[model samples]
Target: GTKLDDDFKEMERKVDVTSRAVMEIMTKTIEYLQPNPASRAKLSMIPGYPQAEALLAEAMLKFGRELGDDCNFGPALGEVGEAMRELSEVKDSLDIEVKQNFIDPLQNLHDKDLREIQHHLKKLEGRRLDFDYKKKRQGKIPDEELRQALEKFDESKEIAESSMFNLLEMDIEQVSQLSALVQAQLEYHKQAVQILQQVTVRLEERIRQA
Candidate 1:
């Protein structure tokens, strides 16, 4: 029940990086699938497809960049920059054949998996930020915020434990349980993201898009 501000901040930064790298990969996958201006424009107009992907990518990238600006060569983010660089290379090499043969199915699967991880990370980030904000505003966070932060912290701990358990015991049940937890987390965060989307337009309208 000790507060872990430093540890949580580091984890949040790394998760931001991981989430952004995954989003960049997915964006490149979309480009690979479309690969032409007409196709890209068409896909962009489709609901819950390219637009959703782009918005998610934009959020991830912005959060990641902010975190990177604040933190220095932390261990958690050690592979993150490399991951982004690798994703960029993959994007550059993407072609029609890559889309048809590899990028389509593989990237979709990867995206789904990363989305689950990102969801858990988002929950962690939200809780951490909430705690920090409350601490700053009131000089100490309330019991409710502390409880919520601990809950998310435990969820992340459970995930790490389950991974080690699966490796040690080779228990398929561990995998199944972990998958269910991640799926539930993903659904929860999907709803959260939808709610934020509705309110974020005013904030986003001021930002530049690339």
Candidate 2:
């Protein structure tokens, strides 16, 4: 087979550039993971990290495939896919673990704090359900019903926010933990691409000289 040194060099350079870009993004993501009062508050207030990590993992895997070694590219691609799945599984486990380790235990530490939040949400929901049931039970509509409907609407907003906080707490915490693992994987792929490019350059040069 005829080996083209220039072509290989160009290809290798492109892969190196791409791998570097991936590393840059991964590094920025790591910086984003640092503890900040604002970020922590936002994370607790809304869902943030888990979804972001999942997206980052997907992008890393795609970039890996795009810059993979020709001979082992298929397996590399397969491995990336597998890594994504594993990351997802780990994220889920972390979610459950954090809830058990932090949220559950903390709630257990204080009965009033736990019951107050739970009771508030349940009371809001129960009131809304009761109003709905009463509306259905009545055969005729009343003009005063609009006021009751609006009251429930306001209560629903509070309930929604509470639910959001609960969900966000789980997802964000899981992703916060998973980000380190994703960074390690990113470094591994970056090194692999760098090594492969070096090998390709050397092999191409030897073939050309022969």
Candidate 3:
């Protein structure tokens, strides 16, 4: 593939991850988890993270309308469609009580998410080498600079993924300190917001490069 083609292909994969994995997770959070407006409002409760709250509410409104249009549960709710139906067969079904708090949250993020974070992380940490700069910047980026840049990229990639996992892998109890049925799902949607934003950034960069 041409460089542009490679970038395009890579971005296509990220877009798929966003649409299929990320968006569906959000849709399900609201559908099965936060079906009620009050629960949905709780999802919009993040104050400093105003954009976070807005992203949740906006996607949810679209999600709810799509469902009303009978858009067959695409990828959200997982593949347990039959399980959902079968579960209702048992009268007065109840959710399991939270056990010990899920102490360790999943910290690994999607590959593209890690890459995007890696580039931005390098900027924050003040690591720059000619190759890392992404554009022509005068002479020799020393061999040591090359090695150090590679090391920082790898380290930042891991840290980036870890941060996302830290936020996402929490159960309802761990997330909000109170186990609302929707909070678990809401957290995933919060994670999804990061994913969609990262993917959009990646896609736009590919377009610009092309």
Candidate 4:
């Protein structure tokens, strides 16, 4: 293998770990738990963290609206609850966007492109070892058999080299996936900041009144 080959092989290993970590982070951020199946599946929810927070906000919203102007703190409580509801909607959009643009691509690379390289590399190693063994036993092995083994080794090397080159040349694909990841986060944060800004103004007024 050339120096380029060594570098790409290292990169592929890193990519495998990177993909796994991203999957873990996304799942942890979105899911709270998966309940045991012993009992009847009476729940209507899918156990997402965003959905849980939305439900919580709705409960508060209901209580605050019921209290209305009758309670001193009701208005402020309702306002904050509304903000939470809107934030939950933003989170849902982020979740969907990341899964489509980021997670899916990363998983595809891991399953297809990276896996293809691994297959070729393994075959190449096997063929190389076969050729080496036959060459070392030259006196015991027939000359024709040794020549055939060398041919198989060369063929395997070419296949592996082609696979590596293909992946390295399409570097833009991985870069675009990374860009999509950051883009989703940026949109989510921008919206969240705007929502919080308005909420901040309303809360300040309530505090001054008090």
Report the number of the highest-lDDT candidate: 4
TM-score of each: 0.31, 0.28, 0.26, 0.75
Each prediction's Cα lDDT score? 0.47, 0.48, 0.39, 0.71
lDDT of 2 at 194: 62
Q: For each predicted model, how many residue pairs clash, with residues at least 3 apart or on different chains?
A: 0, 0, 2, 0
Distance (Å) between predicted and true CA of 83, model 2? 1.7
Best of the two (2, 4) by lDDT: 4
**lDDT for 142 (candidate 1):** 68
lDDT of candidate 4 vs native? 0.71
Flag regions of model 2 displaced more than 4 Å.
1-48, 51-53, 64-71, 111-210
Best by TM-score: 4
lDDT by residue for model 3 over 55-112, one digit each (tens)? 4445555554566534433323222332233332210112111111111111122334
Give candidate 2's whole-model lDDT. 0.48
Judged by lDDT against the true structure, how good is candidate 1? 0.47
Ranking by TM-score: 4, 1, 2, 3
lDDT by residue for model 1 (65-136), tens: 666744542322323433343333333233333434333434453455445555655565566576556556
TM-score (C-alpha, index-matched) for candidate 4: 0.75
Candidate RMSDs in order? 24.8, 23.1, 21.4, 5.4
Pairs that collide, model 1: none
Worst 10 residues of 3 by lDDT: 97-106
